[PDB]
Design a binder for this molecule. Structure first.
Ligand SMILES: CN1C(=N)N[C@](CCC2CCCCC2)(C[C@H]2CCC[C@@H](NC(=O)c3ccncc3)C2)C1=O
Length: 388
């Protein structure tokens, strides 16, 4: 049974441009589309004209706007966002039937933040206060939601990749998934939910204990897989892996798929690869299994993704084209949107754990499916975690 009908199918978007939910801010309510970001902790919205925005938060039109008289400067690898802090009344129309008083960062300047044609005007940082900007005293949205209402301290995400390119009109008309606030909807997954501990409450940090490519053990010291951390991030497109892990994984993926040669640009995630309509050779590409620490001592489980997850559909012709959605990182593993598209992911903050189950909307073929399986006996899993 699906017990959260009001929130099912409340997301739109895609892996490369982000998945967003409708929200309202202020009095009278101002409707805005907001990217769901499990990799950050600020509710930050466009609040001034920008070439990529067709609407923005107008503080002067909200009777409930409260100015905190404080600026916030947020540089990150790709760019930055800057703004002015305040609070206002916020609601999620296809969400819990509540209105909360929340912090809002009114974005006034940015670089490589907004995405042209993404249809979103701000981001909802769903991670913990530790990584909120300027500091941990700026209460994140979800913390405000839980404190002010009877909403359970849990949310779950079903990000639905279409498996093919969606043009501008299609991506606006299409259901991109669900964000269930305060619960788990059983219609969004098949099989069982398996839980991994949240190692520390800052990002949604997890511990990977083993990696396989078509069942072949990558055989690295498991600390390498979590160097310097492993996180679950809906605000990142790719599966990102630490340099050494990336080099070993790409070697193994190349070897498994060696019946076809792909240019260096494809493996660097820059160049698309194309096949005649319907002839994508899924079977030559391997499945990838990530083993995660379990809730029981010396127990792990595995999540298995297909090339239908790690090859991202892009438009070129009538050919079926893709980009390789696995890339190198110098800041740890990032389980981005392309990985999350395979699974229904439960962010169980109350029980400091993340659940994974096979998504009812994952893209697959008639011969293979994504999987979530366990248990496996795995020793010294705490040693897989990186310190300092
Ligand atoms: C990974 N990642 C993420 N999950 N959220 C941010 C902020 C991280 C935050 C973590 C805690 C400390 C402070 C920083 C922000 C991201 C939001 C989605 C749109 C993105 N836009 C682009 O990447 C982009 C790139 C190029 N052109 C346009 C847009 C930018 C980020 O870098």
């Amino acid at each position: 049974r699906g017990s959260f009908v009001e929130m099912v199918d409340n997301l739109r978007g895609k892996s490369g441009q982000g998945y967003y939910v409708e929200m309202t801010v202020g009095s009278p309510p101002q409707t805005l589309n907001i990217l769901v970001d499990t990799g950050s902790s600020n509710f930050a919205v466009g609040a001034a004209p920008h070439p990529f925005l067709h609407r923005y938060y107008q503080r002067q039109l909200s009777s409930t706007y409260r100015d905190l008289r404080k600026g916030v400067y947020v540089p990150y690898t790709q760019g930055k966002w800057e703004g002015e802090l305040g609070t206002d009344l916020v609601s999620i129309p296809h969400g819990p039937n509540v209105t909360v008083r929340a912090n809002i960062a009114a974005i006034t300047e940015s670089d490589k933040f907004f995405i042209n044609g993404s249809n979103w005007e701000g981001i909802l940082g769903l991670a913990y206060a530790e990584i909120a900007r300027p500091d941990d005293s700026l209460e994140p949205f979800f913390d405000s939601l839980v404190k002010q209402t009877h909403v359970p301290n849990l949310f779950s995400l079903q990000l639905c990749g279409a498996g093919f390119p969606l043009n501008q009109s299609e991506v606006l008309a299409s259901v991109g998934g669900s964000m269930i606030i305060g619960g788990i909807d059983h219609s969004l997954y098949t099989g069982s939910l398996w839980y991994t501990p949240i190692r520390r409450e800052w990002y949604y940090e997890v511990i990977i204990v083993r990696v396989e490519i078509n069942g072949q053990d990558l055989k690295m010291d498991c600390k390498e897989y979590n160097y310097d951390k492993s996180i679950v991030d809906s605000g990142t497109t790719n599966l990102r892996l630490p340099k050494k892990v990336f080099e070993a994984a790409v070697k193994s993926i190349k070897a498994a798929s060696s019946t076809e040669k792909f240019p260096d640009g494809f493996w660097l995630g820059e160049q698309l690869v194309c096949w005649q309509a319907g002839t994508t050779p899924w079977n030559i590409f391997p499945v990838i299994s990530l083993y995660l620490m379990g809730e029981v001592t010396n127990q792990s489980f595995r999540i298995t993704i297909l090339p239908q997850q790690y090859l991202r559909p892009v438009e070129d012709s009538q050919d079926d084209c893709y980009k390789f959605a696995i890339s190198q990182s110098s800041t740890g593993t990032v389980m981005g949107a392309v990985i999350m598209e395979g699974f229904y992911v439960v962010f169980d903050r109350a029980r400091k754990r993340i659940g994974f189950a096979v998504s009812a909307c994952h893209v697959h073929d008639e011969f293979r499916t994504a999987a979530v399986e366990g248990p496996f006996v795995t020793l010294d899993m705490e040693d897989c975690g990186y310190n300092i």
